[PDB]
């Protein structure tokens, strides 16, 4: 009987212009997502360079997301994690206070908590707010893995925790998850394997590619949720080349490059330690892009 946020979702890039958050660009990109069938937007996740934004920039992009999605069906699943439990709790309350429909909370990075620590970490977050909480497992970035058992325990013990965004290249784990707890919302955080995760009972994606091709990712997800597996697989197969090229360098360097190449943002700006891609990868992204039809504003 849990409240959930599922479907086609986009981990929004955060455009910079002259080192500032391009707030009008942010709103325009979100409207573009809404107009192409996206079900929810994820402000200031990994793809939004959450690590290099200030807390005010944090609030500004959640507020823009919440405003722009008002009066539409599109929900706002705000990035609000940290590797310090006390800060993650504050960011959760902060996100709720700004009107987010739920929070995406990344597993603590760098300090490698144990499974017991991860349980108490997320339990403290879940008890702090009364909006849905989606776990976020990306061990290649955090250095830790939320075990299947820990995810299931958190799902069963805490009311707001309703699923997990898996970015782990481990379809075995997604079988494990849904075989032992079929009530949870398994969310793909790995564009290349969107369809295999959905076809096994996953209920959504939090996509990088959808920044560039929101119509294609949304269509894929809705095909799969409607059990039209043949058409969902067909879009997944078509998207493989771009899905992979968007990680030739660390996300979000390629996707922001692609967004700039398509004319969707005004300046290829990052905040250090992130930076422009290599010129060979610049050309690689530009070539893979030309084979896809990119909607405008």
């Amino acid at each position: 009987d849990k409240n959930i946020i599922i479907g086609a979702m986009t981990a929004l890039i955060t455009p910079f212009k002259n080192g500032k958050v391009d707030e009008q660009s942010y709103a325009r990109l979100i409207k573009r997502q809404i107009e192409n069938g996206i079900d929810a937007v994820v402000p200031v996740g990994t793809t939004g360079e959450s690590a290099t934004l200030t807390h005010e920039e944090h609030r500004t992009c959640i507020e823009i997301a919440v405003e722009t999605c008002k009066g539409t069906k599109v929900k706002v699943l705000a990035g609000a994690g940290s590797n310090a439990t006390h800060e993650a709790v504050g960011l959760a309350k902060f996100a709720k206070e700004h009107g987010a429909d739920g929070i995406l909370s990344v597993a603590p990075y760098y300090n490698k908590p144990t499974q017991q620590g991860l349980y108490e970490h997320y339990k403290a977050i879940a008890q702090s707010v009364d909006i849905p909480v989606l776990l976020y497992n990306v061990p290649g970035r955090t250095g830790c893995e939320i075990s299947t058992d820990t995810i299931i325990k958190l799902f069963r013990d805490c009311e707001n925790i309703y699923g997990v965004k898996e970015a782990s290249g481990n379809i075995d784990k997604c079988v494990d998850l849904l075989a032992h707890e079929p009530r949870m919302m398994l969310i793909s955080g790995e564009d290349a394997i969107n369809y295999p995760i959905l076809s096994n009972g996953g209920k959504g994606v939090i996509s990088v590619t959808s920044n560039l091709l929101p119509d294609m990712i949304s269509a894929l997800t809705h095909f799969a949720l409607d059990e039209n597996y043949k058409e969902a697989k067909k879009i997944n197969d078509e998207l493989y080349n771009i899905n992979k090229i968007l990680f030739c360098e660390s996300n979000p360097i390629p996707i922001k490059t692609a967004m700039y190449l398509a004319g969707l943002i005004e300046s290829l700006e990052f905040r250090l330690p992130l930076c422009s891609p290599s010129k060979e990868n610049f050309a690689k992204i530009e070539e893979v892009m030309k084979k896809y039809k990119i909607k405008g504003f």
Copy 2:
């Protein structure tokens, strides 16, 4: 292309007093046939191919071919080697013993390059006129057949029709079928049978089906009939046993399970394989309690 697909079983090789129990072997193959299996794989990894003599190799292929006569069930004989000259000989020998096709594992230990793997399989494919299925299991061989190499071999050689993937890498299975949708992707990883079938895979070469042939058969055929809800339901249902059968290196758990179920008479391996630990014995037994194990 001529193909061999569907639900397939990597047959264990039972031993009695250190020798191949040929009657048990035939009885086990008949059990597979009667539970809906589409093909059997003699002397694969699960069949302890490494420790059988060539002569035992022939004996197990012949029993498989003889036991499948008068049925639709094909024999996809294990016939690989990390020496190309030997792999060619095993392919030709498998064909001469009546196999319908060969499963040919990527060279283990000596780590050929992608160029070497191409020439290896091309020499095998040109040696026979029966279907050849590639077999990628990097955790055992120390090498990986890249997507590009698999696709090139599929396109350049008439007998090569697909690959048995045992790599825990669903991304690669998207890669394979997205760029070459005509190939037969075969799952060599029981736990992810359904995700591979759901992405367009056309069969399984199963370990679990030694113990639960009816469930693996039903899973595969549901998926091939695009009844994905029913295939997933068996896959989720099989997860516990699918994993426990790898608590020690295959085929140590599956032979242990077969012995616990009374399907083979003696828990015998050939060294360097051996009985499992007493705790893993108990674990296999416990996981087994939740499943319905067909007899003979």
Copy 3:
């Protein structure tokens, strides 16, 4: 280049009632000074830098700086972040607080490219005029500072004088010192302190030294004098404790050990870090009985 080398300790940060036990911190540092340690590292990974406020970062740097005045012991302050603008600020801040140098961990989580890491560390190095030691620990950060990037930063930037390696990769430590023998390679992995020192490493930033500073100090200085025999013998003796201190994620075992001794009064962590399991707890307690633990 100005350098900070020798036997160094990544200081734990004791908590009492959820606050930094300031008295305890100073007393622990004094214990380190009195047992031959050459530098202390406040608020590194072992110091739970991730869960301390900027206020608390300052407090432990200030305590470290004041406690080492009038001694030969240097303060190499932890001052890294995965945001370059913040890493520059923390570097400047550490400087103003009287730190002798900074340890700056590779950006975690956001996985910068080698180009990004170069610009990141170049911005830090140009922000201060005190030595900067790079810190590569890919198991925690998700990224690796390549040998090429480390060498470029060492050669291009004045203050960058070496790297604290915690990567379990002795090949990389050969690579580093073979192509740039002027850099200070620092072991960030206690179990392999001696192999790194014997290949030209010039110090350690130790976890074990929290509990056994005299033994790590002796190991390092034996090695720096090319008394390899004595350095290896201490390294071999410490292997058991060096490993058990990572049965769970550092600093959970070392803080447990410090509590099991008489050195901190409360086994407190800041979530998501927490007390170890009970079996690891007895496990740390059993191994400790083998070593002689200095008091205050």
Copy 4:
């Protein structure tokens, strides 16, 4: 225990017209002897053991044994298998041909358990009365001989005297020699020859010494004499070639290098091994130019 240690070479096996070039094999061996090598390893991994017939196996051991008679140089014959019965046969086979000891690789592909590895090697060790060196190369075999199993085999079996480690794991080499300092740890990884020797290792089984036997010999001897400064410098000098010799799977680069230097007449392999890419060919040739290569 009887031991075979010092500077040792994993001999390449030259082929000419698809056959073992027996006169070249002998010329190369003599070359090794004349440049200070202490033992030669016929038909190991670098000798393409996987693609030689058993008669060619016998031929290359016999040539090694005959060429080393009347010298100090020992012959440590490759004689491993992933089937214990065959590995036992190959061990007895090597002893009857006059080998001084055997190198026996851990079973590849079929991934035996630690218990299985113990029984595998115990059967081999009890089969012969000549020294047995274990060989751990998990990147190629798919398995790993644990420290505990290595130590158990060393303590339980008289002729098992050490291990040739090719695992890029200096922590394990500390673990091994800290808990069992009497065993002979042998480097199977040229780039980290010095770190392994400096920790108490007593020899190397080298790929690089095929091309530069004098340099590997001096390195090893300097180290055995505790002249670590001279051993480390040679190790640092050799790093580039040590790494480039694995741009592609060994022995593809070393045979390419041997051919480029004129030490072998034909760049021939047995499939699935083959010529390197022309990019990597050029790279091997460039790296070579910095080293002084001895002739015959």
